[PDB]
Scaffold this active site. Sequence first.
Site, mmCIF file in Angstrom:
data_model
loop_
_atom_site.group_PDB
_atom_site.id
_atom_site.type_symbol
_atom_site.label_atom_id
_atom_site.label_comp_id
_atom_site.label_asym_id
_atom_site.label_seq_id
_atom_site.Cartn_x
_atom_site.Cartn_y
_atom_site.Cartn_z
ATOM 1 N N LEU B 96 45.304 62.228 31.949
ATOM 2 C CA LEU B 96 43.934 61.941 31.538
ATOM 3 C C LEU B 96 43.629 62.682 30.240
ATOM 4 C CD1 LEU B 96 41.105 60.738 31.911
ATOM 5 C CD2 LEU B 96 40.538 62.713 33.373
ATOM 6 N N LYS B 144 48.891 53.298 16.373
ATOM 7 C CA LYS B 144 47.631 53.230 15.646
ATOM 8 C C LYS B 144 46.666 54.213 16.291
ATOM 9 C CE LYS B 144 46.624 49.048 18.285
ATOM 10 N NZ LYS B 144 46.168 47.638 18.223
ATOM 11 N N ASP B 161 50.019 54.437 25.539
ATOM 12 C CA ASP B 161 50.133 52.974 25.596
ATOM 13 C C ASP B 161 51.535 52.478 25.257
ATOM 14 O OD1 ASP B 161 47.576 52.792 26.458
ATOM 15 O OD2 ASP B 161 46.718 51.932 24.636
#
Lengths: 279, 271
Positions: B96, B144, B161
């Site tokens: 997290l 990004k 990601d």
Amino acid sequence: EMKAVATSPSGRFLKFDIELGRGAFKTVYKGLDTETWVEVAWCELQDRKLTKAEQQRFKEEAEMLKGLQHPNIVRFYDSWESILKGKKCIVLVTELMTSGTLKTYLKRFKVMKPKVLRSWCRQILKGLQFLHTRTPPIIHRDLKCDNIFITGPTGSVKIGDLGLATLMRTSFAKSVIGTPEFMAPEMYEEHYDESVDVYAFGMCMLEMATSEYPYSECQNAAQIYRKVTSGIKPASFNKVTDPEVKEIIEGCIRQNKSERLSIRDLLNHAFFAEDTGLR
Amino acid sequence: EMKAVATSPSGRFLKFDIELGRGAFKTVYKGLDTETWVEVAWCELQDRKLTKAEQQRFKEEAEMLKGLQHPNIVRFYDSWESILKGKKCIVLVTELMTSGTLKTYLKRFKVMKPKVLRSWCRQILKGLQFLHTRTPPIIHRDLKCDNIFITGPTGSVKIGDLGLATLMRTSGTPEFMAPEMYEEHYDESVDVYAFGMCMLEMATSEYPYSECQNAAQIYRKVTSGIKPASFNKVTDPEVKEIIEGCIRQNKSERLSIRDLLNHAFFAEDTG
């Protein structure tokens, strides 16, 4: 004096108001070479909003196409940008193939004949072998039955539309992992060689032999992509029982490009045997 | 950390009915590791129709993601499929990052400070260094500011990601298009390029090539070697020189990750 409605900038070619065909974004008119009195195809390509850099790349490609002479390659005469009567377009003057494409000609017949398949495919292969032995080699990259042309009264079959897909490419071809703002230029590069034409030839031969479009069982390119990238052949392949045609198509559509036959290997197959001047 | 509303299939992770944010393809809830009492991110992904093959591939890739332990990579704990509001979805449990993405955190500020830029970028580089030296190398391919994350109260910055772009992807002539035409070609230097654009985004507070109206114009400029308009709005000449060295058109001319890590601009703040 000729009932012509336009002349090329060189003055060499006349356009007649006679429509010979219509494809996506193009109209083919009857034209005339005033030097030889040979009837030609005057093709008007809709402007694709090309930039100055792309217009320069096609001009160099068009000059190289002018030099290609081979009995199984549609001759390319000239090209230019036109704005006559306010219609903006690119004009291509080529050899006139009176029966249109193989796709169009095949619509007239129910089942393919083996002697016809042999003749048509041998001619296509000779055109591809010509292209692949230029300096540097020319790869068609978009070979299909709708850009192979035929003249009905001779059975002459010629490959056409060289460079057209690149000229008319509206968008980047396929989708790539990444975000455009952050994607390095080399991620747009395309990696291919002569064996992409071998693969396309095999699919063309399958289409001709079975009188149906390969992978028509798929509802969208997503299924095709998944079948093709999984090495699963089109269902229409199961209809090919002639063992020579089956082994020829199998040798072209192998998933691993390094395992595919070359064009010359294909021309060596006994199925395409002819006469060599030896008796 | 009271009243769980869901549990992972293994029993290890609890979900709380506390939505912490939304991201690319995801809704993030507060979760808990019952074994360690560490709070985690419980991420519910938009439903995708995956074949049995793609499902197996993700399962094998997820198992590899569990092994990627590095201070500048968001840790990946677990994943599974669940029926959420009638549709089959993937749930992921990850580390997290309480302040969200760098892109979100940046919205709270006006002008980038050089010491901040140096700290955030040094951490991104250490993460890329880790990924590129796995066996085999892992190339992020979608780096990004929207998938780099930060914890405000520590300044810790981590790449996340991984593989999400490929998982969540959707949609010559197809029937005649040889399988090799679908292959994507890239190496470590695509991440160096994206890093340079990340640094440009932080330094100027805008997306690169924002003056372009659509993707085709970007494609035209990038293939032409034309840099984004924001590149010339970079005030710091040292920042500008580093960015230029990452986004060189010829990938073989770009700085390496080792070059960037050892550049004086990114020297650690030990004094």
